Design a protein around this nucleic acid. Structure first.
Length: 42
DNA sequence: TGGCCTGCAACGCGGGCATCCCGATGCCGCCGGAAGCGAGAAGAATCATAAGCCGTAG
């Protein structure tokens, strides 16, 4: 079973990765100014 | 408190007029010296191209 797929999966995965990195990795919050790594460590 | 400005009377010589000599000057012919325009060459400068570090991620 080899279903034919469109190239748009590239852009979809890129958008998903960009959203994930922007939300949960890089940008801290304004209520405490702490990264999720620092949060988990504390 | 001391010096500049000015009225006044007496001494002084320069301005005004006449004139012949002199030196600048316009003109003409002749000789020369920057010039300036374009063109070629040199230096000065701002735009365009390849990471490096910052800290997590694989």
């Amino acid at each position: 079973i080899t279903p034919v797929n469109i190239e748009e999966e590239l852009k979809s995965s890129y958008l998903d990765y960009a959203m994930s990195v922007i939300v949960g990795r890089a940008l801290p919050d304004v209520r405490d100014g702490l990264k999720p790594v620092h949060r988990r460590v504390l």
